[PDB]
């Protein structure tokens, strides 16, 4: 059973799966686009969404909230001062995922890209 | 054998004569007829009832043609209330008076591949005292060289639930004809959203 349960397991434990969503965020934000496996991507899209949407709030509290995960003060500045005001007019949906044609050789992992929109 | 299609919306208790009563609510009406069975043309009596409007932008030629003859816009699904022939062109919730007892059929929840413990309520092994990996196992399934086989219908692990099950003689508690609702003393099978058949009971 599993009925009506959101959120994936990704063959990781709690301690781990969380760091994943973070380092995946930290990378996505510092690069604007990254390539990951399909399901790893579909989880990540929600994560950076709340983070960014949070930075749209701009306040120091919100900033201290995002800081909890992103940890890097420098990155967080970039998120607030440059990433977010670009998204002021948009409400939710700051993230785009798209499946890639080439799976990766070593294991036939279907791939996809994840990027911030314009 | 009056009846109607509906959707199990949810449960919630109410109060009556200072007693609390567990109630599962069921969105019932309206249900337009689509075809009437008749011994002359069908070999028996029943009625094909529609429920929940369909988007004509999804209907196909064979279905639309069926719907046209009955003279009624598209609908989500059809089920037959056997041996019941209504005079109205639409069966409403009105057919049930608070007090009446009813049988409710609904597709049960789906446990998927289930263990013999959850399915058949087998005892399983002990959790201790030397049990080598059979803590939930079904144990013995037969004898020896006679019969030299396992009989049919041996209780064993498989898919549990997600199947038709009718719950008998349930009390109609209430009717909200203006909302097309229907209240029922007890618990109805399937999930909050499932298809259901409410029907006149067969107990005396």
């Amino acid at each position: 059973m599993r009925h009506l349960k959101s959120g994936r397991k990704l063959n990781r434990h709690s301690s781990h799966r969380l760091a994943l969503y973070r380092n995946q965020a930290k990378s996505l934000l510092t690069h604007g686009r990254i390539t990951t496996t399909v399901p790893k991507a579909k989880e990540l899209r929600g994560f950076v969404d709340h983070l960014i949407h949070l930075a749209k709030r701009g306040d120091l509290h919100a900033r201290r909230l995002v800081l909890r995960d992103l940890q890097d003060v420098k990155l967080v500045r970039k998120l607030f001062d440059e990433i977010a005001p670009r998204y002021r007019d948009r409400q939710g949906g700051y993230t785009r995922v798209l499946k890639l044609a080439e799976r990766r050789r070593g294991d036939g992992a279907p791939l996809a890209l994840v990027e911030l929109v314009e | 054998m009056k009846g109607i299609l509906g959707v199990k919306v949810g449960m919630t208790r109410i109060f009556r004569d200072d007693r609390a009563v567990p109630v599962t609510v069921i969105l019932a009406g309206p249900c337009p007829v689509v075809q009437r069975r008749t011994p002359e043309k069908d070999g028996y009596t029943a009625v094909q009832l529609g429920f929940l409007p369909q988007n004509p932008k999804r209907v196909n030629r064979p279905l639309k043609g069926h719907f046209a003859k009955a003279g009624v816009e598209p609908v989500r699904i059809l089920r037959e209330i056997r041996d019941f022939n209504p005079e109205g062109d639409t069966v409403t919730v009105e057919i049930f008076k608070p007090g009446e007892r009813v049988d409710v059929t609904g597709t049960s929840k789906g446990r998927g591949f289930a263990g013999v413990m959850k399915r058949w309520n087998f005892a399983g092994g002990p959790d201790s005292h030397g049990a080598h990996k059979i803590h939930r196992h079904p144990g013995s399934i037969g004898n020896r060289k006679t019969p030299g086989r396992v009989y049919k219908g041996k209780k064993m692990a498989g898919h549990y639930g997600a199947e038709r099950v009718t719950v008998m003689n349930l009390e109609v508690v209430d009717v909200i004809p203006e909302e097309n609702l229907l209240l029922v003393k007890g618990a109805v099978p399937g999930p909050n959203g499932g298809l259901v058949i409410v029907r006149e009971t067969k107990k005396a």
Partner: protein, 137 residues
């Protein structure tokens, strides 16, 4: 077809409003309708409310009360007709939603742990006494 609202709609006809707000730690006194033999009457159960499990009309609460050496907890459906009234005897500053721990506490300890909630007491005797004022004549 908001089945949610449908259910809450069904409930609406059984919803009460006449009841005071209260939080765990507050000491209350439910007047309950009971039946001794055949007759109807009112019985006052007064104790600390140790939990509230909110859930719309179906919300309920547990009151705990020592009674002749025996501790008794009792669970009341908040919107039952068998509740004539609920009087707030004394409001207290809890710290968590489920005061279960006081199941195992000396009265001296319950006392020290659940002190009087000055704010909600002050605001209570400020308001309502402000409502006694407004409806002059």
């Amino acid at each position: 077809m908001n089945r949610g609202a449908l259910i809450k709609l069904v409930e609406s006809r059984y919803v009460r409003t006449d009841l005071p707000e209260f939080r765990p730690g507050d000491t209350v006194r439910v007047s309950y309708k009971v039946k001794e033999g055949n007759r109807t009457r009112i019985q006052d159960f007064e104790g600390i409310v140790i939990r509230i499990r909110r859930n719309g009309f179906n919300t309920t609460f547990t009151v705990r009360k020592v009674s002749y050496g025996v501790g008794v907890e009792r669970i009341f459906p908040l919107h039952s007709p068998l509740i004539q009234k609920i009087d707030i005897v004394q409001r207290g500053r809890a710290r968590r939603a489920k005061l279960y721990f006081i199941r195992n506490l000396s009265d001296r300890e319950i006392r020290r742990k659940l002190r009087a909630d000055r704010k909600r007491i002050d605001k209570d005797r400020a308001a309502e006494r402000a409502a006694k004022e407004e409806v002059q004549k």
